[PDB]
Each structure stands twice: as C-alpha cells, then as structure tokens.
C-alpha cells in the first residue's frame, strides 16, 4: 500500500510492539479502529498504532485525518495479526490506541517511543 505513509521498520517496530505489549499488560490501551477514533475524539489516546495490511486499507486510513488534525502520533506496522498477538486478543487487530495516565509504570518508555515516532512524523 503506497498510501500507508508512515510505516515502521525492524528496530522501531520491535520497540513499539514491546511497549504496546506492556500497555496491554497493565491494560491501558484500546483495541479497534472505531475505539481508536473514540479515543482520538475524547483526547485520551497518547498515540495510535495501525496495521498497513488491512484489505482494503481505507477501512483504516480515515483516522490519520483527524489524528493529524488533533496532532497525535500514528504509526503503521506491516502485520495486523502481529499487533493482534501484541495487544493480546486472538484476533487480527487493525488499530490500537494507547491511553494515558501519569501514574503509569511504563510512562518513560511511552514517552521515549512517542518521541521516536515524532522523529519521523
């Protein structure tokens, strides 16, 4: 998909799959495209991971629009089943938002990976 614009690679995709694993471990992420847009609407989500594998990709790429309108980071990993196993349900997951509280036990790596996303915009 040439229209899946920010797509990761091995190091940063491994880091974001690790941090989404720890976020699902303490259970403060949201799983699903419309739930990701709900979090984008109510401003809760720290950033968005999406899957540059969905058929067609326009089921997913609407939330980039309001995501950059609300200036949130948003990344593509190249496999929906990979980040589904990352988020810890048994289903192919198309998008996942990661919420925010400041008492979080993964706060510093969340901030590190979101600066890593913003380094490629």
């Amino acid at each position: 998909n040439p229209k899946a614009f920010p797509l990761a690679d091995a190091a940063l995709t491994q880091q974001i799959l690790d941090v989404v694993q720890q976020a699902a471990n303490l259970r403060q992420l949201k799983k699903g495209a419309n739930e990701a847009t709900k979090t984008l609407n109510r401003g809760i989500s720290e950033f968005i991971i999406m899957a540059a594998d969905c058929e067609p990709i326009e089921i997913l790429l609407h939330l980039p629009l309001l995501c950059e309108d609300k200036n949130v980071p948003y990344v593509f990993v190249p496999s929906r089943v990979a980040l589904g196993r990352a988020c810890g349900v048994s289903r192919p997951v198309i998008a996942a938002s990661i919420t925010t509280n400041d008492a979080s036990a993964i706060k510093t790596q969340i901030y590190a990976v979101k600066d890593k996303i913003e380094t490629l915009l």
Partner: protein, 225 residues
C-alpha cells in the same frame, strides 16, 4: 464590543465586556469555522491565535508587517485553508490572496471556502514548482510561509525570487522541530536567518510566539533584488 484598528487595516480588536481580536468579512452570514461573530450591523470574525499562526504573530506585533488591504498576498503556508480566510478578510476585495497547497486533504475545504470567497485564488500544485504555476499568478506583493517540510528557506527563496516583486516583503513561520529537533530554538532560528540573509532577504524581526504554540518563531524580511 468596540472595534479598534491596527496599523494594518483588516485586523481589529473587539474589546469591551470581552476583549479579543477580530477581522473583517469578505463573506457575510456565518463564521466559516465555528467562532463568534461580533456585530456592530458590521460583522467581525474572531480568529484564534492557537488555531492560526499568523494571528499569534499579530499578538506579537511588528514595525511593518507586509499584509495591507491593497497588498496582494501569496500564501505558501500549511495545507489547511483556515488562516487564508482571515488574510482575505484583511486584504479586502481590492487585494487578493493566492493560497498554494499540494496535499489535497485540505485542498477540498480550500476549494469549498474559496468558492464562496472570490478573494482567494487556490493553486493546487506543489510548493516547489512556481515554474509550473506561472500562468495563474502575476507579481504578488507579499509572501507568507508556513511550510514544515525542511527546505523552508530554499523553497520560499525560489518562490520569492520568482513571484514576489522588487522591494517586497516575506513573512515566514520558521519551525524548529519540523526541520531540526534536538538542537535549540535560537540556534536553528539564527541558522534560518543566516541562510535568508545569504539569500539577500534583509531580515527585520524574529519572535518566538511562545504561549500560543511551542518553539516556532516568525521571521520577516524586506526583499532586495
């Protein structure tokens, strides 16, 4: 509720029981983005210095800002068609703004506002080939820039020496992070002012507009051929 004029006719202060900044209307009826209309009869549109970037530069102010109500304005700019409405509201029907954006995700809303506002000329090629949009423009009297993709100075340099006239004026919102993160504000800003005066645009003023948005200054410059 009383209207105060700035140095530039087109930017006013609606102050009174609430105090804020407004512009004129080149289109009556309604706020095209969802702000309040001050009524005096005469209508006045708020524009938020957060959701705009030139508006907070008016909250910075200038000895001579090159937007005047006869001064033809070019707007390379960010792709959103938000602030070009108020550049139109400043310039009135005698001047004209040419807004040039490439990514057509706000190109459609730009076309939508510019249909009901004949003050705006929408150019929908890239911001890097004025040789390609020659025939839709002639000898603009000012340029404004809000491009974030990192060859800001070189590409507004090419636009400013192709279309902006002699002894005209440039006004740029120079970003820090969108060209160079990890290096500080005044460093990358003085680097940009260095390459501008290398391109013989005489700089006049930079200021960071801090509480409205973080670490993006505006620089302004006289042009010298």
């Amino acid at each position: 509720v009383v209207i105060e004029p700035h140095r530039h006719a087109g930017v006013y202060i609606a102050r009174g029981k609430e105090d804020l900044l407004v512009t004129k209307n080149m289109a009556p009826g309604e706020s095209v983005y969802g702000e309040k209309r001050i009524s005096v009869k005469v209508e006045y549109r708020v524009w938020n210095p957060f959701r705009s970037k030139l508006a907070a530069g008016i909250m910075g102010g200038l000895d001579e800002l090159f937007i005047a109500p006869g001064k033809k304005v070019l707007y390379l700019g960010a792709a959103s068609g938000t602030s070009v409405s108020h550049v139109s509201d400043v310039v009135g029907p005698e001047g004209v703004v040419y807004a040039v954006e490439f990514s057509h995700r706000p190109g459609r809303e730009l076309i939508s506002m510019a249909k009901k506002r004949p003050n705006i000329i929408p150019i929908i090629e890239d911001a890097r080939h004025p040789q390609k949009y020659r025939m839709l423009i002639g000898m603009v009297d000012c340029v404004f820039a809000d491009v974030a993709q990192p060859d800001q100075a070189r590409i507004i340099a090419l636009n400013s020496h192709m279309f902006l006239k002699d002894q005209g004026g440039v006004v740029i919102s120079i970003k820090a992070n969108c060209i160079d993160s990890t290096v500080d504000a005044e460093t990358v800003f003085a680097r940009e002012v260095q390459k501008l005066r290398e391109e013989r645009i005489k700089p006049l003023e930079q200021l960071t507009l801090e509480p409205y948005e973080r670490d993006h200054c505006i620089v302004v410059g006289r042009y010298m051929r």
